[PDB]
Ligand binder design. Structure first.
Ligand SMILES: [Fe+3]
Ligand SMILES: [Fe+3]
Ligand SMILES: [Fe+3]
Ligand SMILES: [Fe+3]
Ligand SMILES: [Fe+3]
Ligand SMILES: [Fe+3]
Ligand SMILES: [Fe+3]
Ligand SMILES: [Fe+3]
Ligand SMILES: [Fe+3]
Ligand SMILES: [Fe+3]
Ligand SMILES: [Fe+3]
Ligand SMILES: [Fe+3]
Ligand SMILES: [Fe+3]
Ligand SMILES: [Fe+3]
Ligand SMILES: [Fe+3]
Ligand SMILES: [Fe+3]
Ligand SMILES: [Fe+3]
Ligand SMILES: [Fe+3]
Ligand SMILES: [Fe+3]
Ligand SMILES: [Fe+3]
Ligand SMILES: [Fe+3]
Ligand SMILES: [Fe+3]
Lengths: 158, 158, 159, 159, 159, 158
């Protein structure tokens, strides 16, 4: 349960970290005139923060102490030079989100914390949906960027 | 305040001059079967004239003498051979608009003309928005035009 | 014909020239506290501009090359000292608009340009209405201004 | 700065002073059977008071101490014998309102009080509109009063 | 100017930092069963974030480079033992927010960045309103806490 | 009737004087974070001015010469150190209002000015209502202030 409490706290930090990485992606896309991709990243930035807020709320109700940690500066953004790079980082971000939730769930299972397991169930399912959606967009971006200018049409229309 | 009155009068001319350049761009686009880009230019031509009329109305209220100058014929059209050339000239036009507004604000600031500075505030913010939008369209135009026919396909879906 | 093309192109200039003369009239009226007359002129300024855009749009469709000319400074304001002077210049301006359209239609007739003649028909009729309306306003202004202050009383009530 | 605080506090007095001068104008107009002009003045009296309350409310929020001063007796009525005299005093009053606001904004600028400058922006623009409107009414009144009875005819129709 | 750009970038960090301090206040309140005060702090956490996004959006449009900085761990919460302590840190936070906006506007003034000054105007006015509201809540919290249990009684009704 | 015309003119001044004292109370309350009491005072400041305007309108109709006097600066604010002090001064203000209306009615009665007495009737009844309301608020304020913080709790619920 000490491990559970420590991981629950780190999960807040993870959600807020992810929020900031999505924000840096939104900024990179806007700077490079990919306004449609930027709006998607901005929406996820708000949603990851809300996820973090949901964990905080559950923890307060369940007497899991929360100590808010620094949210580190997002760093992958230094390296991005095409939309494909940005989507690839976002995929890895969500894969790491998924792994941290599964690790938290396994800590909860070990100490028979059925309430935490129940709380995590809709998050496990949303991660399935999200990794699928991001993986698909990444495939489409990679394919369309094979012809000069063509990826600009993904952004403008969809 | 002489400088302020002079610059305020020149700003009207600048707005009507830009309205004419936008009309020239709309004609070039229509002649070359870019009806969607032509519609955008025609809307901006009307907006610029409305801005000129706004300055005229304020000047009349505040007793800033207005002497309507000739609106010079647009010339940049003679060098346009692709939509990228046209959008680049429109970007330069809006950048010149922005600079003329900043110089006018500075002349107002110098003679403590708070009412003129207050009047200009929404125009300064509008120019921020417009330069961003124009700069973004130009980047998309330049990229899409890397593939024969692709730019055409995205005039039509707009 | 080359002549119809030139005149069609000049017609755009005439409509924008008229738009600017109307704006100049609105400014004189506003500066001199005739806000009702000023509103009328501002409405016409917008409408003349709309007429010019209608000509441009037809030209683009019909492959009549358009080259936008300078829109001259409106200079009639130099001799405006009363509302009657302004309305007289406005009458002359609409008389010139009408003549310009008639000359254009004559060039179209000479080269059998039935589409241009058909396009101009509603504008010929509008000019009839407009010259009549401006001529009547000028008569009213001229008459009311025979008594001090009376013309003011009717900028306020009307327009 | 101490100067911005003093001027901000004086601005409340100026708005209430103006409110009372407008009420005095409404009374002169009512006593002399210009009920249309009187209504206009009464509307402005209420509005100037509302402007003063807006300044007080901002001051309270921003911890600018307000000490309410005497609102002087409006004395311009002593030389009012025609509507033109009243409108001329009203023009001068709004010209003073504008100067007062500009002096305030200058003190705010000098001490980098961006919040006070931002607060004043809509009032600077309102003063532009108001000076223009009063200047125009004064011109109309002055012109119509050149013919006996004519100005009356336009208190009734308008205002 | 490059400096103004740095101060603009740091204002984003300032807003996100404030967001997290408001979140830490919400947590302390919830942990101590002050759910009403907690909800208020959560609302401000969202709003401070929204302000930071507004700055980011303006910067992207105006080509002001945005580099997202670390958001430091909130530390004041280690020291809070009563709602009065928390409200006092929140007041200092907003006072700090106000000072940093004024310093940014001053940098903008120095380099004639009229667009930046215009953008900031609503935020200056919002800080005036917010400091007033927080200052007032703190004063009520301080007063009500003089009687055991009374403060509780007004987390429950108000908030 | 000289006395009546004099008192009628002094009544306008009294109403505007009370409007200013109410504004002063609203400022003291706002400065001391009693926003609910401040709102009440601000509403009364507007009402008193409306009463003054009512007297002005009647006077103009009935040809009672009106000469607008200075509206003196409120001074009672200098001695206010708690809400009870403020409410006590407002009670005294309304009591003075009532007395000035009664004296004016008496002067009207003496010169048989039935129209002025009829005009005053709803104001006499309004003052009855207002003195009762103010007297009642003062009693509640005085009682609630016996316990630290308790008065504050009841400004907020109003
Ligand atoms: Fe999502
Ligand atoms: Fe989602
Ligand atoms: Fe996500
Ligand atoms: Fe635009
Ligand atoms: Fe626009
Ligand atoms: Fe534009
Ligand atoms: Fe017309
Ligand atoms: Fe016409
Ligand atoms: Fe028409
Ligand atoms: Fe007004
Ligand atoms: Fe006014
Ligand atoms: Fe108004
Ligand atoms: Fe730097
Ligand atoms: Fe930098
Ligand atoms: Fe740096
Ligand atoms: Fe807020
Ligand atoms: Fe807010
Ligand atoms: Fe805030
Ligand atoms: Fe850096
Ligand atoms: Fe009342
Ligand atoms: Fe009442
Ligand atoms: Fe009362």
């Amino acid at each position: 349960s000490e491990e559970l409490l420590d991981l629950f706290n780190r999960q807040v930090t993870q959600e807020f970290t992810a929020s900031q990485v999505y924000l840096s992606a939104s900024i990179w896309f806007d700077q490079n005139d990919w306004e449609g991709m930027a709006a998607y990243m901005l929406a996820e930035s708000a949603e990851e923060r809300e996820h973090g807020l949901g964990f905080v709320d559950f923890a307060n109700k369940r007497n899991i102490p929360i100590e808010l940690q620094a949210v580190p500066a997002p760093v992958s953004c230094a390296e991005w030079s095409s939309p494909e790079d940005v989507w690839q980082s976002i995929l890895e971000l969500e894969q790491a989100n998924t792994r941290s939730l599964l690790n938290l769930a396994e800590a909860a299972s070990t100490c028979h914390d059925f309430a935490v397991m129940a709380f995590l169930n809709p998050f496990h399912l949303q991660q399935v949906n999200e990794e699928d959606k991001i993986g698909s967009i990444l495939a489409k971006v990679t394919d369309e960027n094979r012809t000069p200018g063509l990826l600009r049409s993904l952004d403008v229309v969809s």
